[PDB]
Write a new protein. Structure first.
Length: 193
């Protein structure tokens, strides 16, 4: 007869871009192979299908970081294709952001304070936990020797105690739990009233 549905698949490995599934055959007799059905959790469209999986374990790659996914497994034998299992829900791991905060802007508020603001990076790869604002009077320095101000998840901050009539270079990165993303390319702001 046709195969019965495989056992509900179990996620046993995950990375930022892959999910590894294992399942029970769900069947008394041997199965020829399996088909994995996968989609984003909140897609309302039909599952995509990976055909011809010859074992009861498979890693689905390259998915995107910090994303919700739905999977099912289908068994096939010589008679044909059985019903899909019950779905499993899961989520790929986070990464550091892989793009810079966008539209980074700064303007003078006084001779000693500026206003810095930006937009969220397009590629956060995770929950943004905060931003780090780098600023200096000498941008030839390594960024780790610039002055630094840490911020929570936000898009605007003020920075004070600046020396008047100076060009300050400013760079901003976002960070997730995993790590720091890239720095925006330098902008300049002058402490001139």
């Amino acid at each position: 007869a046709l195969p019965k549905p495989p056992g509900t698949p179990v996620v046993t490995e995950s990375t930022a871009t892959s999910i590894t599934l294992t399942w029970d055959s769900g069947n008394p007799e041997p199965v020829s192979y399996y088909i994995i059905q996968h989609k984003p959790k909140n897609s309302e469209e039909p599952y995509k299908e990976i055909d011809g999986i010859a074992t009861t374990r498979y890693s689905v790659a390259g998915l995107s970081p910090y994303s919700d996914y739905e999977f099912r497994v289908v068994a096939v034998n010589n008679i044909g294709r059985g019903p899909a299992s019950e779905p499993v829900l899961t989520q790929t791991s986070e990464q550091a952001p892989s793009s810079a905060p966008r539209d980074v802007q700064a303007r003078m508020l006084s001779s000693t304070t500026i206003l810095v603001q930006w937009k969220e990076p397009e590629e956060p790869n995770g929950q943004i936990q905060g931003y780090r604002v780098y600023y200096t009077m000498d941008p030839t320095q390594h960024v780790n020797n610039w002055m630094k101000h840490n911020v929570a998840d936000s898009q605007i901050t003020t920075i004070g105690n600046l020396v008047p009539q100076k060009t300050y270079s400013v760079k901003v990165l976002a960070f997730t739990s995993i790590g720091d993303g890239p720095l925006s390319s330098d902008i300049q702001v002058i402490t001139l009233e």
